[PDB]
Design a protein around this ligand. Structure first.
Ligand SMILES: CCCCCCCCCCCCCCCCCC(=O)OC[C@H](CO[C@@H]1O[C@H](CO[C@H]2O[C@H](CO)[C@H](O)[C@H](O)[C@H]2O)[C@H](O)[C@H](O)[C@H]1O)OC(=O)CCCCCCCCCCCCCCCCC
Ligand code: CLA
Ligand code: CLA
Ligand code: CLA
Ligand code: CLA
Ligand code: CLA
Ligand code: CLA
Ligand SMILES: CC1=C(/C=C/C(C)=C/C=C/C(C)=C/C=C/C=C(C)/C=C/C=C(C)/C=C/C2=C(C)CCCC2(C)C)C(C)(C)CCC1
Ligand SMILES: CC1=C(/C=C/C(C)=C/C=C/C(C)=C/C=C/C=C(C)/C=C/C=C(C)/C=C/C2=C(C)CCCC2(C)C)C(C)(C)CCC1
Ligand SMILES: CC1=C(/C=C/C(C)=C/C=C/C(C)=C/C=C/C=C(C)/C=C/C=C(C)/C=C/C2=C(C)CCCC2(C)C)C(C)(C)CCC1
Ligand SMILES: CCCCCCCCCCCCO[C@@H]1O[C@H](CO)[C@@H](O[C@H]2O[C@H](CO)[C@@H](O)[C@H](O)[C@H]2O)[C@H](O)[C@H]1O
Ligand SMILES: CCCCCCCS[C@@H]1O[C@H](CO)[C@@H](O)[C@H](O)[C@H]1O
Ligand SMILES: [Cl-]
Ligand SMILES: [Cl-]
Ligand SMILES: [Cl-]
Ligand SMILES: [Fe+2]
Lengths: 137, 81, 334, 342, 451, 38
């Protein structure tokens, strides 16, 4: 089995467009995700709120949809609750709150795309492990 | 003592090192190449990183029959395309 | 001589059947208290709410235990590291429900055993011996301190100290494995080398000396009568024992010096057990065994399990089951 | 009598750096193949087809995680000979089928026999009593009960211990969860013999070193001993008084002391071996029946014994699907045993 | 090669440094060179940390133990412990590294080139271990030096910028201490506090005024004591109580250092004042409490009444009483109710955690901080995989509190062992039987039988 | 409980005082050989 261009091809938006990430983009995505996100989201779960995970299906049912690059990049700019009703930048890392989450200060747009790509690609590799928690370890 | 030349004599002699400055690196390089050419994988039948699973498969190729175990292994190997 | 001098002379006397001494002056009452409390509690103490969740655990013989299942049960998680002497309780019934006996016993015991070590130093001095037997005893003593005091301090509760019982000891070990992966910790590994090695060398030395006993008896009497207490000559032939063992392996892998040999016999288990103790004492502050969970990954990114991951599944079983009513939040953080 | 046999005996018993002997003919190839087989496997050989595990340096394992793993459960107790009906002379397939496991177990067993025979042979040549070999009977009983009798009682070699550090740790945890092995009085006697033996080692070495006679001027006291000397290098009398006054009792007979040092760890290991023979048949000390009847009737009755069984149940359910792949266990999330939150 | 083999010195190579006991020049060299090694490590390690330092990541995510020590002193940091200037760290590093060359130079000189003994060269620098007065005098010099050090901390706190104060009104910040606690009832009060739960002896020090005043007291005490020991010689009772030899003094110091090591272990494990959680990460208690806080906040946002929510055991799922009645967090963290930290105290009333403040007054920054601390709990593997033992690889983290605690427990323990070794040996040597029993004068042979 | 507390405190103090004054009563000299360790 290999990390092929097909595995690395994920939805760009909700209108059927895809983007194919490079292997280097994938590595950058894993690195940046560990750097800024894994402290809470290791393995696709959420330690401070296990009801909400990073599974692709879960992201598709979010408001607005978060199962594509645009949705995820926007989330990293202006995160909302699951129903889209409140903005939660004050308690969740984002560019908008880079002042109080200093690790977001150096993240560029390229970086956000890499992180989003990671979030989308991992379950294609890991399946149920991604978002699964200790049951699937 | 039992008669053999003392080790301390041997490993401090010039001739010992004339010999072993050749034989030791030669062996070390031979072992390196055993891995680096990929020969080890083929000798011991150990999977390369791209050969544990076919692209979409997620089930272990577990041997399940005693007397046709060999052919089972061969079939597993074919299924890696 | 005044009464204080006479008293001092008796305390420090080399002629007492059991040596007393100044360390002994503290050792004797403290060990007597821990022992008496332990015996009474092991037989007759009611159930103890070890985890502070109003779920009392029965440890005593009279309350449904045998020798294997019985224990004196650690004090309540509600207490934590607070000092809980008898006089802090409103009543003995309260004291017992909350596990007061555990604290009385472990504190008196740790003090008394520390004094036992000191007393070994002291008698060695009174007799004109060299002083380091007590250093050998520091290894088991440090181990006791690790499981009864240091681990509780690090975790924030005497409820996590080792229970005073056989099955309770096993419980402590299994939970420890779930929480620290102790088998994969190199200090526990050195501990195991220490005790396996100690047993090996014990057997080895026993066997070599026994093998080289000089003939002094007939076939119909125990060969032990060939040694007489205080005889000046050695009772076995070390030259022959060395000829043997030296040929078993090779000459330079065998000791010819009895002093070096005996120092080795001391140092191998003592050092290994020092590390065993330090293992528990450092896992007390959650610096844990090696973690190779999902260390091996294939070209696509599939996890390739190793034996480490199987260990991980075992540890998960232990983790998710232990203290089944005591956790409300997803992470067990002590 | 000086025919070829006696000439050979002469050569075999030469006083050389590494003694050979008749026993050497069995011991050297078997020990060498066992060690070489282990190093070869842990460096190059997978456990993908037998266990679904990576197990070699070649695949990315480290010293703690490498192993030569047991054959698949479907092999049963096959000797798994290279020329046998499973591998059919194919070396690569033999490695993939777990042939190195039985290679190592069997050559290892015959090598242990060779080593004990070496202990006898040398003792006889040198003119000493053979207590070292006798003491070696304990390593023999452990190896034979754990690596041979135990899996022979179970379904297959798969359940023997795999030769690796982490693999052995897994063996321990399997025995806790499935056998409640810590509850077994034969294991308990084993533990007492091992820890008691370690105790005796430490205390005897320390006592000798702290009752030395001053037989030299140096502050480092090792040189003040001569292997050929007749005198005891330390005082048994002083040692006896010290221990009598510290502990209540003390050795007074040096011969009995050293015999006891043989007896304690040797007997402990033999006892553990007996317990493992019972575990080969699942004849465990798993439960106390009286405990279970009481706990079943009374939901407020709790001991450390019942507390440990819940841990065992966790181990079984959480480890079995991956540890026993031939069973094809699928345990849905809802059936997994778990306390609150965790 | 004076005294440099086993036959002349009586000591084997593996105890070679014992050959230095009565060679004061060379021993001076060993000591100065060793000091050089220490200072060297401080400088080099500081530069290493700085080179590997990313200013927008918390320190504790980066395996730092020295930079935290510098920042605690108020150098390089601002509000909340944010790094505003790394130059001070650079300075501390460089200056220690440069000084180590000087110390090493002196050490090497005295050790292999200078006079081997100092006595014939100088009455002032020369000494006999058995000369009680000379010993007390040198002890005195060193006490005065320590006192000056303590006063240097006081000077930093009061006149040169202040200290980082995790407790500063409005949020942690560097603050100048203008009113150090001088009241001896407070200062020595700490010394008489129990070391058990909710008391914690001196480890309980929880404000910089007490820290600074305490250091004023220690400075004056050390200088006064030093003067005392220069001007006096040991009394009869001391003379009769002690062993007077180099190995004995060494053993005493080994016991003292073991004690201090255990203490430092506890300090770094529990205290969050002189070891600010901003720099060192949260304490174990802190992170546990933080988890409880985190889920209280989550569930209460969802609509839960956290005061009245009964957990599976009958105890409150979120909130319960301590054994003396205080309102505390529930679950296993009931053990950690003695915890105190600036993010939690605003929710604390007279009777403990206040339900009204919990319902109405929890700020976003408190939620953030509790989430951060909960997810940086001091648990992790030897190879630095963060989290519980069963956690998968992903996060490279072991808390500095764990590194510091574990290292100092190991060191303190072996130092106790060293105390026993050298104390027992000093006794035996002073009495004259450290080399073994005189065959012609075995004491036990002159004693009556026990039975 | 108060009486118990006072009693235990008195007992403990008694034994600690014995320990301390005992080791202060010329201990280095209590050995079989060279006593003058003063
Ligand atoms: C000659 C020497 C004298 C010998 C005679 C015997 C003397 C009496 C025996 C003492 C034994 C004490 C045991 C309890 C140790 C302990 O619970 O120590 C913990 C305490 C700290 O206590 C904690 O202190 C905390 C203080 O923090 C508080 O204040 C902070 C301020 O920032 C924070 O806000 C924090 O959140 C807040 O809770 C809290 O009070 C906790 O509840 C409290 O538990 O450490 C301390 O007092 C100081 C450190 C004590 C040393 C540690 C003992 C190690 C000994 C090992 C020996 C091995 C021997 C081997 C033999 C071979
Ligand atoms: C000298 C000590 C020694 C011993 C005791 C063993 C023992 C073993 N080896 Mg090892 N081996 C050795 C040295 C040894 N080996 C050496 C030096 C090598 C390198 C060449 C090997 C390489 C090796 C491999 C590759 C394998 C073994 C295997 C084995 C096992 C099966 C052997 C078997 O069935 O033989 C059967 C043969 C005999 C018992 C010979 C008896 C001779 C009789 C008494 C005389 C009569 C013979 C007769 C006249 C011949 C007629 C033949 C004709 C009818 C066709 C057994 C544990 C197998 C194994 O481990 O599987 C897991 C295996 O695959 N060995
Ligand atoms: C902190 C570590 C340390 C220090 C400072 C010392 C110091 C000393 N040892 Mg000890 N020793 C140590 C650890 C240490 N030891 C260890 C670990 C062992 C076990 C291996 C020993 C075993 C031992 C024995 C057996 C003996 C000593 C002796 C000595 C003394 C004289 C050595 C001599 O004559 O060297 C001669 C060596 C040389 C001429 C070679 C060069 C040595 C220099 C110092 C190296 C400088 C390198 C440095 C990078 C230069 C920087 C320069 C720059 C600042 C300008 C000296 C005071 C001896 C003694 O007691 O004499 C009375 C002695 O017999 N040591
Ligand atoms: C107070 C002592 C101390 C502490 C608490 C730390 C802590 C840390 N160091 Mg530092 N460091 C130290 C001393 C210390 N170090 C020393 C002496 C050196 C010079 C070698 C360094 C040079 C150094 C470098 C180059 C790096 C660190 C790094 C780190 C971080 C990761 C450590 C790690 O992964 O270890 C791994 C664990 C081990 C190596 C296990 C050690 C086990 C020892 C050998 C056991 C010894 C026991 C006892 C002492 C022996 C007694 C024998 C007995 C028979 C008597 C961690 C914060 C890393 C970092 O993150 O920097 C940003 C890093 O890259 N340190
Ligand atoms: C542990 C500290 C220490 C001590 C007690 C000594 C003691 C001695 N040294 Mg050594 N030496 C040391 C460290 C030490 N030295 C260091 C660090 C160096 C490198 C600079 C040297 C390099 C050295 C040389 C090259 C020589 C000596 C000599 C001497 C002898 C004569 C000293 C004298 O008369 O000075 C008189 C005193 C003064 C002139 C005043 C000193 C002013 C000081 C330095 C100001 C700073 C004080 C302050 C407290 C420093 C704190 C530092 C702290 C941060 C670590 C004397 C035995 C001589 C000798 O042995 O000849 C045979 C000799 O030739 N020393
Ligand atoms: C009474 C001694 C004492 C104590 C309890 C403290 C405590 C503290 N110091 Mg201070 N300090 C001291 C003396 C002390 N110091 C001295 C002598 C100096 C000059 C070297 C300093 C210079 C100093 C600096 C520069 C800094 C501190 C800092 C600190 C704080 C954090 C460090 C720590 O954990 O140390 C733990 C302390 C110990 C383990 C020592 C325990 C002492 C025990 C109780 C007594 C030992 C007595 C001895 C064995 C008896 C001799 C025999 C006699 C009976 C005859 C902590 C509150 C840091 C700080 O406050 O940051 C804001 C900091 O940056 N200290
Ligand atoms: C490194 C620091 C240090 C060292 C090693 C010494 C060493 C000494 N001092 Mg000095 N002293 C010092 C600092 C030091 N002093 C300071 C800073 C002061 C000012 C306060 C003094 C003021 C002083 C006076 C007034 C006297 C000494 C004396 C002595 C000598 C005997 C002390 C003794 O018996 O201790 C052991 C202590 C005792 C025997 C007393 C009771 C022992 C109990 C068990 C103590 C229990 C403590 C326990 C561990 C609890 C710790 C925590 C607790 C504080 C809460 C000895 C040479 C005596 C002397 O001979 O002077 C010429 C003396 O009279 N010192
Ligand atoms: C199997 C088999 C066989 C055999 C083979 C062999 C015989 C082999 C051998 C092999 C070998 C013989 C190998 C070896 C190896 C080795 C190694 C690999 C080593 C390593 C080492 C190291 C790594 C080191 C380490 C260490 C230690 C140990 C301690 C100290 C420290 C250190 C770290 C240094 C035959 C053919 C018969 C048949 C078929 C099968
Ligand atoms: C005696 C003796 C000994 C020891 C010795 C010693 C211990 C010594 C030490 C020494 C030392 C202790 C030394 C030190 C040195 C140092 C130096 C030499 C430094 C320098 C520095 C520099 C040059 C810097 C630079 C820089 C800067 C300035 C900036 C930043 C960057 C850098 C870092 C580049 C022994 C054991 C061998 C044995 C014999 C005897
Ligand atoms: C800075 C500071 C502070 C303060 C501190 C202090 C003020 C301390 C003091 C301390 C002290 C004040 C200490 C003391 C110590 C003492 C000792 C440690 C002693 C010892 C003793 C001994 C060791 C003895 C012994 C003996 C005996 C018992 C018997 C007879 C013989 C002899 C002599 C051997 C505070 C916390 C506020 C806060 C933080 C900062
Ligand atoms: C809080 C605990 C108490 C702390 C006290 C420490 C303060 C310093 C003063 C210590 C006083 C020591 O006083 C000490 O007492 C005993 C009893 O008289 C003296 O007398 C002792 O001398 C000889 C020594 O050969 C002993 O054999 C004899 O049994 C005893 O009388 C010691 O010689 C004296 O040094
Ligand atoms: C088993 C060994 C059997 C040896 S057989 C034996 O061997 C002698 C030489 O060794 C011969 O001289 C003799 O004739 C023969 O019977
Ligand atoms: Cl779900
Ligand atoms: Cl449990
Ligand atoms: Cl909880
Ligand atoms: Fe012996």
């Amino acid at each position: 089995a290999e990390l092929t261009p097909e595995v690395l091809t994920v939805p760009l938006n909700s209108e059927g467009k895809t983007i194919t990430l490079t292997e280097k983009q994938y590595l950058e995505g894993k690195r940046l995700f560990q750097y800024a996100c894994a402290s809470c989201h290791v393995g696709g779960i959420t330690k401070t709120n296990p009801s909400l995970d990073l599974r692709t299906e879960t992201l598709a049912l979010a408001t607005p949809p978060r199962d594509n690059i645009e949705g995820l990049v926007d989330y990293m700019k202006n995160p909302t609750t699951y129903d889209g009703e409140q903005e939660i930048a004050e308690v969740h890392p984002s560019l908008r709150s880079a002042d109080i989450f200093p690790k977001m200060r150096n993240l560029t747009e390229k970086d956000l795309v890499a992180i989003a790509g990671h979030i989308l690609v991992e379950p294609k590799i890991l399946g149920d492990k991604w978002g699964g928690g200790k049951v699937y370890y | 003592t039992t008669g053999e030349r003392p080790f301390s004599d041997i490993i401090t002699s010039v001739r010992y090192w004339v010999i072993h400055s050749i034989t030791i690196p030669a062996l070390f390089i031979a072992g390196w190449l055993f891995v680096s050419t990929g020969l080890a994988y083929d000798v011991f039948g150990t999977p390369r990183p791209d050969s544990y699973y076919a692209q979409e498969q997620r089930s272990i190729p577990l041997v399940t029959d005693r007397f046709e175990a060999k052919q089972q292994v061969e079939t597993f190997l074919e299924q890696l395309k | 001589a005044n009464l204080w001098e006479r008293f001092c002379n008796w305390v420090t006397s080399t002629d007492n059947r059991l040596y007393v001494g100044w360390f002994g002056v503290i050792m004797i009452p403290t060990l007597l208290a821990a022992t008496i409390c332990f015996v009474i509690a092991f037989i007759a103490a009611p159930p103890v709410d070890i985890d502070g969740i109003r779920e009392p655990v029965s440890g005593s013989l009279l309350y449904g235990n045998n020798i294997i299942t019985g224990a004196v049960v650690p004090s309540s998680n509600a207490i934590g590291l607070h000092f809980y002497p008898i006089w802090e309780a409103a009543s003995l019934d309260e004291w017992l429900y909350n596990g007061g006996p555990y604290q009385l016993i472990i504190f008196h015991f740790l003090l008394g055993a520390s004094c036992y070590m000191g007393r070994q130093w002291e008698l060695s001095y009174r007799l004109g011996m060299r002083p380091w037997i007590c250093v050998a005893y520091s290894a088991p003593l440090a181990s006791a301190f690790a499981v009864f005091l240091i681990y509780p301090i690090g975790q924030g509760s005497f409820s996590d100290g080792m229970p005073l019982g056989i099955s309770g000891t096993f419980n402590f070990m299994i939970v420890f494995q779930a929480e620290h992966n102790i088998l994969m910790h190199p200090f526990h590994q050195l501990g195991v080398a220490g005790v396996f090695g100690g047993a090996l060398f014990c057997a080895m030395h026993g066997s070599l000396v026994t093998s080289s006993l000089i003939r002094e008896t007939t076939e119909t009497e125990s060969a032990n009568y060939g040694y007489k207490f205080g005889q000046e000559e050695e009772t076995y032939n070390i030259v022959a024992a060395h000829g043997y063992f030296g040929r078993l392996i090779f000459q330079y892998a065998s000791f010819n010096n009895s002093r070096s040999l005996h120092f080795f016999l001391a140092a191998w288990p003592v050092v290994g057990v020092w590390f065993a103790a330090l293992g528990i004492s450092t896992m007390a502050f959650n610096l844990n065994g090696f973690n190779f969970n999902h260390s091996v990954i294939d070209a696509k990114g599939n996890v390739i399990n190793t034996w480490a991951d199987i260990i991980n599944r075992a540890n998960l079983g232990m983790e998710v089951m232990h203290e089944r009513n005591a956790h409300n939040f997803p992470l067990d953080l002590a | 009598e000086r025919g070829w046999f006696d000439i050979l005996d002469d050569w075999l018993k030469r006083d050389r750096f590494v003694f050979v002997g008749w026993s050497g003919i069995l011991l050297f190839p078997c020990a060498y193949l066992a060690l070489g087989g282990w190093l070869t496997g842990t460096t190059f050989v997978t456990s993908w087809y037998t266990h679904g595990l990576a197990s070699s340096y070649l695949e990315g394992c480290n010293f703690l995680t490498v192993a030569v793993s047991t054959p698949a459960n479907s092999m049963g107790h096959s000797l798994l000979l290279l020329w046998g009906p499973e591998a059919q002379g194919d070396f690569t397939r033999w490695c993939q089928l777990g042939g190195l496991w039985t290679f190592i177990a069997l050559h290892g067993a015959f090598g242990l026999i060779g080593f004990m025979l070496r202990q006898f042979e040398i003792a006889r040549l040198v003119g000493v009593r053979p207590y070292n070999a006798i003491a070696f009977s304990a390593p023999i009983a452990v190896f034979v009960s754990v690596f041979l009798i135990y899996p022979l009682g179970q379904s297959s070699w798969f359940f023997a211990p795999s030769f690796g550090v982490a693999a052995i740790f897994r063996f321990l945890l399997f025995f806790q969860g499935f056998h409640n092995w810590t509850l077994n009085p034969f294991h308990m006697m084993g533990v007492a013999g091992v820890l008691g033996g370690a105790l005796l080692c430490a205390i005897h070495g320390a006592t000798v070193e702290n009752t030395l006679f001053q037989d030299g001027e140096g502050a480092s006291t090792f040189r003040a001993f001569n292997p050929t000397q007749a005198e005891e290098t330390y005082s048994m009398v002083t040692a006896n008084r010290f221990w009598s006054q510290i502990f209540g009792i003390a050795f007074s007979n040096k011969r009995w002391l050293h015999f006891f040092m043989l007896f304690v760890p040797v007997t402990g290991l033999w006892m553990s071996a007996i317990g493992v023979v019972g575990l080969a048949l699942n004849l465990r000390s798993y439960d106390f029946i009286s405990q279970e009847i009481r706990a079943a009737e009374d939901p407020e009755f709790e001991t450390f014994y019942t507390k440990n069984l819940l841990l065992n149940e966790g181990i079984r359910a959480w480890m079995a699907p991956q540890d026993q792949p031939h069973e094809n266990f699928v345990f849905p999330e809802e059936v997994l045993p778990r306390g609150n939150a965790l | 090669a004076t005294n440099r083999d086993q036959e002349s010195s009586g000591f084997a190579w593996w105890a070679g440094n014992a050959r230095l006991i009565n060679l004061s020049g060379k021993l001076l060299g060993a000591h100065v060179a060793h000091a050089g090694l220490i200072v060297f490590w401080a400088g080099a390690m500081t530069l290493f940390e700085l080179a590997h330092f990313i200013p927008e990541k918390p320190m504790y995510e980066q395996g730092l133990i020295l930079i935290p020590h510098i920042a605690t002193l108020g150098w390089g940091v601002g509000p909340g412990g944010e790094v505003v200037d790394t130059f001070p760290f650079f300075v501390v590093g460089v200056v220690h590294l440069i000084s180590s060359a000087v110390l090493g130079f002196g050490g090497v000189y005295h050790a292999i080139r200078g006079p081997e003994t100092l006595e014939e060269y100088s009455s002032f620098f020369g000494y006999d271990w058995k000369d009680k007065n000379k010993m007390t005098t040198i002890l005195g010099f060193h006490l005065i030096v320590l006192g000056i050090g303590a006063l240097l901390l006081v000077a930093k706190a009061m006149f040169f910028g202040g200290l980082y104060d995790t407790w500063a009104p409005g949020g942690g910040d560097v603050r100048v201490i203008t009113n150090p606690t001088l009241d001896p009832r407070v200062i020595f009060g700490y010394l008489l506090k129990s070391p058990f739960g909710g008391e914690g002896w001196i480890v309980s020090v929880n404000n910089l005024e007490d820290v600074v005043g305490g250091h004023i007291w220690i400075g004056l005490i050390c200088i006064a004591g030093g003067i005392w020991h220069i001007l006096t010689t040991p009394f009869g009772w001391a003379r009769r109580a002690f062993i007077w030899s180099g190995e004995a003094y060494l053993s005493y110091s080994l016991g003292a250092l073991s004690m201090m090591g255990f203490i430092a272990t506890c300090f770094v494990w529990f205290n969050n004042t002189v070891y600010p959680s901003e720099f060192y990460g949260p304490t174990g208690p802190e992170a546990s409490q933080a988890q409880a806080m985190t889920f209280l906040i989550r569930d209460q946002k969802l609509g839960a009444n956290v005061g009245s929510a009964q957990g599976p055991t009958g105890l409150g799922k979120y909130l319960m009483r301590s054994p003396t009645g205080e309102i505390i967090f529930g679950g296993e963290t009931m053990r950690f109710w003695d915890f105190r930290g600036p993010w939690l105290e605003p929710l604390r009333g007279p009777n403990g955690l206040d339900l009204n403040k919990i319902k109405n007054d929890i700020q976003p920054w408190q939620e953030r901080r509790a989430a951060e601390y909960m997810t940086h709990a001091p648990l992790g593997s030897l190879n630095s995989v963060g989290g519980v033992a069963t956690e998968i690889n992903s996060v490279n983290f072991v808390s500095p509190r764990s590194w510091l605690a574990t290292s100092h427990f190991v060191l303190a323990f072996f130092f106790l062992v060293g105390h026993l070794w050298h104390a027992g040996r000093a006794r035996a040597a002073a009495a004259g039987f450290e080399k073994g029993i005189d065959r012609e004068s075995e004491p036990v042979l002159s004693m009556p039988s026990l039975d | 409980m108060e009486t118990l507390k006072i009693t235990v405190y008195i007992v403990v103090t008694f034994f600690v005082l014995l320990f301390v004054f005992g080791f202060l009563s010329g201990d280095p000299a209590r050995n079989p050989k060279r006593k003058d360790l003063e």
